[PDB]
Paper text:
Imposing lower than six-fold symmetry (two-fold symmetry for the type 2 hexamer and three-fold symmetry for the type 3 hexamer), or no symmetry (type 1 hexamer) gave the highest resolution, suggesting significant deviations from six-fold symmetry in the hexamers. We first performed fitting with the localized reconstruction of the pentamer at 7.7 Å resolution, followed by fitting the resulting Gn–Gc heterodimer model to localized reconstructions of the hexamers at 8.0–8.6 Å resolution. Consistent with previous biochemical and structural studies, this fitting verified that the Gn and Gc assemble as heterodimers, which form higher order ring-like pentameric and hexameric capsomer structures on the mature virion. Domain A of the Gn forms a ring on top of these capsomers interacting with domain II of Gc, occluding a surface area of ~950 Å2.
Virus entry is completed upon Gc-mediated fusion of the viral envelope and host cell membrane, in a pH-dependent mechanism.
Numbering used by the authors:
A (entry chain B), D (entry chain L): 796 to 849
B (entry chain D): 688 to 1118
C (entry chain F): 850 to 957
E (entry chain A), F (entry chain C): 154 to 287, 290 to 379, 393 to 469
The structure:
Amino acid sequence: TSAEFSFVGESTTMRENKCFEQCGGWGCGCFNVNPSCLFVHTYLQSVRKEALRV
Amino acid sequence: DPGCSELIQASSRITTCSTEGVNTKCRLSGTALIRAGSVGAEACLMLKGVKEDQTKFLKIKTVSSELSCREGQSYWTGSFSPKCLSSRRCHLVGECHVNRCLSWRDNETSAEFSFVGESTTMRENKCFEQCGGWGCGCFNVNPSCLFVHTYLQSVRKEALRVFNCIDWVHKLTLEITDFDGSVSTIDLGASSSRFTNWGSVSLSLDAEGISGSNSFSFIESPGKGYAIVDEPFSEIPRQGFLGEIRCNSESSVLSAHESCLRAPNLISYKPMIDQLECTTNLIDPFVVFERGSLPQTRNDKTFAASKGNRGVQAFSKGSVQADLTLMFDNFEVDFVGAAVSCDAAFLNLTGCYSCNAGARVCLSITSTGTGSLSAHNKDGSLHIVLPSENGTKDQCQILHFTVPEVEEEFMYSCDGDERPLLVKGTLIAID
Amino acid sequence: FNCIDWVHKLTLEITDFDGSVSTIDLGASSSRFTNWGSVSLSLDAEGISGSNSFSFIESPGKGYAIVDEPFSEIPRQGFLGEIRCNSESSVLSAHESCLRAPNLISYK
Amino acid sequence: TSAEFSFVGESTTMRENKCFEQCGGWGCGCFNVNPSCLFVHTYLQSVRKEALRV
Amino acid sequence: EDPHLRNRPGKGHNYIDGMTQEDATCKPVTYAGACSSFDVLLEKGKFPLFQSYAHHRTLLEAVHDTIIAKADPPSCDLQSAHGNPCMKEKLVMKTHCPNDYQSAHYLNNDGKMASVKCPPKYELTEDCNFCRQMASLKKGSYPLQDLFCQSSEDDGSKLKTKMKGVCEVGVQALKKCDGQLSTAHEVVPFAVFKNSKKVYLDKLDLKTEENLLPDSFVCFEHKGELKSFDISQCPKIGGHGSKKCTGDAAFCSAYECTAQYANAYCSHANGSGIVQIQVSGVWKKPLCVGYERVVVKRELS
Amino acid sequence: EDPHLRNRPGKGHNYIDGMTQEDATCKPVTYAGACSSFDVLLEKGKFPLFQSYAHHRTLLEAVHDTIIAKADPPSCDLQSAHGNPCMKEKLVMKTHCPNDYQSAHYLNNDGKMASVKCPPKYELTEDCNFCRQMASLKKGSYPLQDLFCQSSEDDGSKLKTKMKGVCEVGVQALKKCDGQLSTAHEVVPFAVFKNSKKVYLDKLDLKTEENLLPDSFVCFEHKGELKSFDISQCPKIGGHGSKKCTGDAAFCSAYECTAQYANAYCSHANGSGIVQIQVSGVWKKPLCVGYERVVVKRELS
């Protein structure tokens, strides 16, 4: 669990943690010339109000 | 242009009304179905509360039929230029051994190049031996050694991202308008879902696709147009191939980061005792980018770029047959009965009949207050909604008919009382 | 040595604006730094394929040579290049950096 | 061995225990909103008094 | 790393009403400061949101920033009778309160600093709803909410709670539920703009847009530990302000360096910028956004 | 370790006007006496170039050897702000020292000696750019660059900056530009020819010939202070000369060694003698190649 989204909790909801590379410097929003990261905390939610047993 | 071509009524099982503050509101906790409109046409959603005048609509404007691409293995590339550094030292002096330079590792900084500095680029260290004696300025009889420290840096101010497409996803850019009037522009492809204020939406039926996309590599340019190459995706980067030096991000190419990949034993060298010229025969992607610049003519389709959202598309010339699933995440729909007047008049009626396009109607609505106007026919198959304000403005939308002599009576209102209205117009045969 | 690809090389004698004579050469897409800047090629043609089955021999101050056989890969007995070296000084002085064929020196 | 059916134990019969998932709330007779369970202790026994040896 | 965990830009005052036992060590907030209302905010495994957004503002710092007013009364008594403002908003809470604490401040619906306090020397219980008899007792309060603030000024008096399909959440009476109410304790965020109500949310989307702002620089005194020094006292180049300022090449490239005429040292920092919030699609500037664990009553059918 | 690198050839003086009162023990530089302007150049992990070429001269020693002149003023005054002679060349340079210094020397654009001065009792910053207030007070000049000193007679004052593609590097304005520049502190070498300016280097290709020249050896007075002894007076092998000399296998392999019957002790050095460099495709002999971390503004958009 990433520190940028650890406040959600370790529940039983289907979740996943990714990690992408962005840019660095003052061209996007940083201070060092090294590229920045992108913490992703994607969780799934139920859409249909009913389930089917195939 | 507005105008819901296909209109359907929501079911009463997922439509429960309520009353709070002399107002009758209702929410939707289900999902309806409606046919996807063509280029120009829309697909409204009639919502009924407890009586007749309380009627809401949800218009979804369709831009055009597009075929987006699905990106998979992507990588950045660009031009580079090495810089050879020579430093010859005598034999038996520090690390000037003829046997150490033979098996010298690339990731090992020698004692004669430990004063370079913060060089976090694609650097390497070789070791080529030379001659000795008093003829080349050497004190020892044994041959001398020449240390090599060449690092790669970026010289081009731009770069390119070479990627491929595993499947052509039929993406439809929809401009969904909420009940109150909130305009939201989204997109739906194949079976993808998004997130709107009224819940969620996803494309249902999809019977349009282009086969044979793995054997085509695409090139993305920052800001400029895209490109297309008639070859399969680049496998392993080897010598003499398009894409021998790749990375992962744009900054890894614009700054020549050591985290990228390159071909082994690619940087050539010219052992000239004391001189050294490190030159590489890198492949220039700008030549292919200029020879194959979008748009191009490929089979019976039109391959071009895309505005706003970055991504490749594919213009088609077929029909638009799809379905939409309007999922309502339990969102309340309120409505206030207006009491302003409005004397509308008919203008013209141009367009076509018996087709997915429709016919444009002209209405001169003259109202004295800011509100909304609702119109309907007699049998219950046509509904026209147009905004109204204080003044005289010309409105209208796209209407569908199956007769060139349209003589349908309309019933429009703006406060409660409904007055008759007759329309007319000659249409043409449009397939 | 051998040759994996024939590069169209053109020896150029670039003369500067002041009058200095500089003789260089270009190949495929290589660039050389000069006084006023750098020069490189842009388009090449006329290529000869199928050169991996031939080995060339270079002589110091004498000339070149051509051999009608594939290039020597691994040294062995009964083949050209039994005992090889890294440089000319490693051959004239017999250094341990060079390789040799296993069990090549016979004995009685 | 379930806790509700502890009066049987690990007997020398063809016993088994399952736990089915059911609904909760006040509509089914519960307090917590979490789904309840269903303790099933079904055992096999002979019917007639004549057997066969195939 | 993270050299900006305890340093608070701008104001940095964690003064609480009623629990007046840390006025000596609390204003300002330095690196070697002592305050129970800030030490628990950086505890490992408690408030990850404050650890991720450390270079911002808090609740009391926002109250002392002349942008958020205090409630009346600011410190309610837990041994009252009927008509307690800190009862309905406190009993519906869920976050467990640690031991050795007496006061507990939070945010009310109107957007003011609301706090409770028991009679000495009674500490809080497990839930923090009631009180009971008494390590050592802390000299301050405990933040009940994990929220943050910044330098914003947009109005939000026309925006209300956008929780669709929710009957009654927390203490606000939204809509009338037609089905059976489902009592469940969940985590629902909230958002308070400049002089507005507690606007709850469902999917918090916060983005950071950093730029050349004066809040991206700090200043610490020299030492022939660390101290505290306001960075807003450094004027531009070729000018003269109130206090002297100096730094390195990054700090001296934009501001005037007085060399030895100052008593601090400017360094190149970051973690500031302008943080936006996703409210009704339109990106606005939050002022009191965070998370609060309340009782959510949803529809069962 | 054995301090065998303290024996500097020639004069070996390291003192400047204004401050630095340690000239009584650093004139010349020998085993006895301590000096902060030279003991920091022998520690590993800092300046490896000077450690590799420790058989020549330094910067101050090159000034005292009629090679590098003295600028006016030779010591920059940090008491007056709002710009002073010695700010544009230092603010862009990124240096670091173990603090507790007052003076610092570097190279200017003209090619002379431009240093700073810290009046007592003021301490420099962690980078040496500005100053601050107040361990021990080291009045010596901290080496800001990593250059050396050598004697040469090859003329070449008709060459400027050889770097191509950089807008404004250091303090030299090669070309104008108001667009986006890749501002980053890079390590770019530099060299000074015979009476030339600050000639920046795009690449370093040194050349050292190991012969029998006196500059290629560090033969000093045999013991069993120490200055630079001429190795040409040593007798050849199988012959006779003037004075006597001795050494190890590297020195005794070509000359003659008499052990205790010698007046000097010769030994082989690592990286000493004629030092050439590549510039404009022509080999030239500079006077001292060093490194600096100045602001390099490369082109972009």
